Structures are given as C-alpha cells and as structure tokens.
C-alpha cells in the first residue's frame, strides 16, 4: 500500500512530530506505525512486519532496553535505531553494543536522516541483489529458448532442402500431364513417377525424423523427487515462491528414462512460475506452489502420480481445451514457444503414463503426471 513501513515507539507526540518532520523533508515514502507500550510494540512487529524500528528509550510503562531485547528475539533482521533525548553520546555508543543498528540523539535530530537513509539504502541493496540474480536467470532462459528455436529452424531448413528436389519433380511431371505435352501412355508413366516421388518424400522425412530422435530402465521414485527438489529450490527463491510438499512415495520404481521424467516435471514448474509471476509481480503471501507425489490406482493398476499445483492465474476455460497442442502459447512469442505441454504429453505417453490437469480459473491449476510402477 505504502512502500516503507516505519514502527515508532515513542510517548511524546511532540518528539514524534519532530522525528517525522525530518523524514517528510526527505520525501521518504513510509507508513507510520506509532506505539507507546509493550503490547502495541509486540503486536505491531508480528502483524504489521515493519521494515524499520525507531525507538525512544523512556516511555511511561515501557523502556528501550526491553524493546531492544524483544526486537532481537522477534525480528532479528529488522534495523533498530534508538532516537532518545534521555542521555548523552557516551551512553548512546553502548546501546550499539547492545545491538541497536544506529543511535540518534533528540538534541541532534539532524543525525536522524543519515541513519534512516543508510538503513533504507542497505534494504534496497539487498532487494537489488536478488533482482540482479532474477534478471540474470531470465536472460539465461531467453538465450536457451532462442538456441532451441534456431535448432528447430535448422531442422525445418534441412527437411525442406531434402524434400524440395522430389517436390520439384512432382510439379514438373504434373505440369507435363496438365500441359498435355505427353501422350496418354507417357502420362501414366509420369503419374507412376509422381507416386514414387511422393513415397520418396515420405521416406526422406522418416529418415530425418529417425535421425532427430535410450531404453527404459528401473529408476527409484525417490531419486526423481530429490533431483526435482534440488533443481527448483533456487527457482522458487529467485521468484520468491513459497513451495509446499504434501506427500512423497519413494521406494517404488518405474521403468523410465529418468531425464525425460524430470523434463516433464520441470516444464510444469516453469508453467507454474510464469503463472505466479503474472498474478503476483511483487512479494505476496499467496504466491505459493504445492508439489506432491503419491501412489494412485487406476483400472486395478498402480501409478506414481507427480502433482504440481500453483495458485496463479489458473487456465481460462476458453483456452483449456487447447493447451496440449504443439506451439500453443498465450505468452508473447519472445517468452513462450508453446512446446512445454505438448512435449510433456508425448513423453508421458511413451512411458505408458498419462498427463492430465484440473484447474479453477483465478484459484489454482494442478498438473499431474502418472507413470505405472514397475513391479518385477
């Protein structure tokens, strides 16, 4: 609502006005929270979560020694600055040793602004560091999508080049028949050649598709979950996503290409992060993701179900039937290739599994991959 949140523990309305006047001269955008006792101070820290505490030493019923001791217990990372008129500088330095972040004397109120600015500058710097890491990650991901598109482009080019020669032959033979440049008997021969060139195009593509494409082996389900956790923890941290796990079922193995199963799961996670960042551009308590594994039984067969539930935008009903189609994306093409869900569905079927989803618009989306357990 308001950028900074400042907690003032102060009993003098006159001194509060003096302190605030110095901050307002700087056009600092802060939300003031004023408290004069231990209950208000204790409640305001927990419920309001201030980014900075400014405390008086002497309040009726409350003291800055107790306030500092409470702050070190409840909000250790929050900067705490004393601003008091009850002692000199000799006494004030000692308070820093007690773990105050800074100390401002009321008779030297000009010192308040540098103390506040340093604390705010340090807070911004911490935010700036996380942001630079997020931007670096996004740039790395854009380059990776671009390298993927170039390889697709090279494959489209090579297949077009090997096909155009027989395609030309088809057009010349058809043109000779259509032009009437051939007797009835040559037209049958040319029509035979057209069939052979059409069969050639189908074979060239088959040899190419086989060139562009390991055996399944038993893999422990737990090995997959540890790898998925290990890969996505940093993604959630960079995106400030809260990640919850509800259940696991290791000690069951599946016949899979482990790398391809992890590829499915990673694609769903990427869809969840994009959905979450679109709904919650800043930090929000509802920017959460649920990751679960479970054993499911279907048609008297047991399956390992991997589930990824995000609380982002959900999938609008008009597009929900069209989401596994190749190249379908609602993101601007610069950020979305539309290949994630279609590749994951292809891989899932190759493993004898299924990929399905449930979503309620504006609430959640849950994608789940089921793969049959290998029982020897």
Ligand X SMILES: Nc1ncnc2c1ncn2[C@@H]1O[C@H](COP(=O)(O)OP(=O)(O)CP(=O)(O)O)[C@@H](O)[C@H]1O
* Range in contact with a second copy (rule: CB under 8 A) among 6-14, 101-109, 260-268, 292-300: 260-268
Least distance in angstroms from the C-beta of 150 to a second copy: 5
Which residues ranging from 83 to 122 are in contact with ligand X (CB under 6 A)? none
Report in angstroms how near the CB of residue 357 gets to ligand X at its nearest.
7
Q: Which does 85 bind (CB under 5 to 8 A by kind): Mg ion, ligand BEF, ligand X, none?
A: ligand BEF
Contact assessment for residue 11 and residue 56, using Cβ atoms and an 8 Å cutoff: yes
Using CB distances below 5 to 8 A depending on partner kind, what does residue 26 bind out of Mg ion, a second copy, ligand BEF, none?
Answer: none
- Residues 260-289 within binding reach of ligand X (CB under 6 A): 267, 270-272, 275
Nearest distance in Å: CB 358, ligand X: 11
Residues between 104 and 133 that touch ligand BEF (CB under 6 A): 106
191 Cβ neighbours under 8 A, 6+ residues apart:
173, 177
CB of 55 closer than 8 Å to CB of 101: no
Number of residues that bind a second copy (CB under 8 A): 66
Q: Could you give the string, one character per residue 60-99, with x where binding to ligand BEF holds by CB under 6 A and - elsewhere?
A: ------------------------xxx-------------
Asked if 147 is part of the footprint of a second copy (rule: CB under 8 A), the reply reads: yes
Instruction: Identify the helix (H) or strand (E) that includes residue 244.
Output: strand 242-245
Breaks in the chain listed by the residue before each, with C–N > 2.5 Å: 213
Q: Tell me whether residue 12 or residue 342 sits nearer to ligand X (CB atom).
A: 342
Q: Does 331 contact ligand X by CB under 6 A?
A: yes
Q: How far apart are CA 56 and CA 12, in angstroms?
A: 9
Structure tokens at 73: 């217990």
| Closest approach of ligand BEF to the CB of residue 307, in Å | 56
DSSP 311-360: -SS---HHHHTSSSSTT--SS-TTT--S-HHHHHHHHHHHTT-EEEEEEE
- Which of 56, 102, 197, 310 is the binder for ligand X (CB under 6 A)? 310
Could you tell me the two tokens for 18? 């003096």
Sheet holding 4-9, edge to edge: 30-35, 4-9, 52-55, 80-84, 102-105
Query: Which one of residues 74, 96, 151, 295 is an interface residue with a second copy (CB under 8 A)?
Result: 151
The listed partner (ligand X, a second copy, Mg ion, none) that binds 178, CB under 5 to 8 Å by sort, is: a second copy
Burial of 83 (0-12, 13-18, 19+ CB in 10 A): buried
Query: Could you tell me if 289 and 310 are in contact, meaning their C-beta atoms sit under 8 angstroms apart?
Result: yes
Token pair 């049959």 is at which residue? 372
Q: Please say whether the beta carbons of 220 and 248 come within 8 A.
A: no
The single residue among 26, 130, 209, 319 that binds a second copy, judged by CB under 8 A, is 209
The residue ranges that bind Mg ion (CB under 5 A) are 11, 56, 58-59, 271, 340
Give yes or no for residue 57 binding ligand BEF (CB under 6 A): yes
Site track for a second copy across 103-142, x = CB under 8 A: ---------------------------------x--xx-x
Instruction: For residue 330, state whether it binds ligand X (rule: CB under 6 A).
Output: yes
Q: Closest separation between CB of residue 86 and ligand BEF, Å?
A: 4
Give me the count of residues in the chain.
376
Place of tokens 């990650």: 137
With CB under 5 to 8 Å by kind, the binding choice for 271 among ligand BEF, a second copy, Mg ion, none is Mg ion
Question: Contact 369/305 with Cβ under 8 angstroms?
Answer: yes
- Rounded to whole angstroms, the Cα distance separating 191 from 195 reads 6
Binding of ligand BEF at residue 36 (CB under 6 A)?
A: no
Helix 340-350 crosses helix 258-279 at what angle (to 10 degrees)?
150
Binding site for ligand BEF (CB under 6 A): 56-58, 84-86, 106
């Amino acid at each position: 609502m308001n950028k900074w949140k400042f907690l003032f523990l102060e009993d003098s309305l006159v001194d509060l006005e003096l302190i605030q006047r110095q901050l307002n001269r700087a056009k600092i955008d802060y939300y003031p929270i004023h408290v004069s006792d231990s209950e208000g101070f204790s409640q305001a820290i927990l419920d309001q979560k201030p980014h900075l505490i400014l405390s008086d030493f002497s309040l009726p019923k409350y003291d800055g020694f107790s306030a500092l001791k409470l702050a070190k217990k409840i909000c250790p990372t929050t900067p705490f600055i004393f601003v008091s008129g009850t002692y000199g500088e000799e006494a004030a330095i000692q308070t820093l040793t007690m773990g105050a972040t800074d100390y401002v004397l009321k008779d030297r109120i000009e010192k308040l602004l540098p103390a506040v600015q340093r604390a705010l500058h340090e807070l911004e710097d911490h935010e700036l560091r996380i942001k630079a890491e997020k931007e670096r990650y996004e740039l790395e991901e854009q380059l990776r999508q671009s390298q993927k598109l170039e390889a697709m482009g090279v494959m489209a080019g090579t297949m077009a080049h090997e096909i155009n020669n027989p395609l030309i032959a088809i057009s010349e033979y058809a043109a000779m028949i259509a032009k009437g440049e051939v007797d009835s008997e040559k037209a049958k021969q040319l029509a035979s050649k057209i069939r052979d060139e059409s069969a050639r195009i189908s074979t060239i593509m088959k040899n190419l598709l086989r060139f562009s494409r390991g055996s399944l082996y038993p893999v422990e389900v737990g090995e997959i979950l540890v790898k998925l956790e290990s890969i996505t923890q940093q993604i959630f941290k960079m995106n400030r996503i809260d990640a919850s796990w509800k259940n696991v079922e290791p000690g069951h193995s599946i016949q899979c290409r482990e790398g391809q199963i992890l590829q499915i799961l990673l694609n769903l996670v990427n869809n969840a992060v994009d959905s979450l960042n679109q709904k919650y551009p800043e930090y929000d308590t509802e920017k959460r993701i649920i990751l679960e594994n479970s054993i499911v039984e279907e048609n008297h067969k047991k399956y390992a179900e991997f589930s990824i539930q995000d609380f982002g935008t959900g999938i609008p009903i008009d597009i929900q039937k069209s989401i596994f189609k190749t190249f379908f994306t609602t993101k601007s093409a610069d950020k979305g290739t539309g290949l994630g869900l279609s590749v994951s569905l292809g891989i899932a079927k190759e493993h004898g599994g299924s990929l399905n989803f449930e979503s309620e618009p504006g609430r959640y989306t849950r994608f789940y991959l089921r793969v049959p357990i290998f029982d020897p």
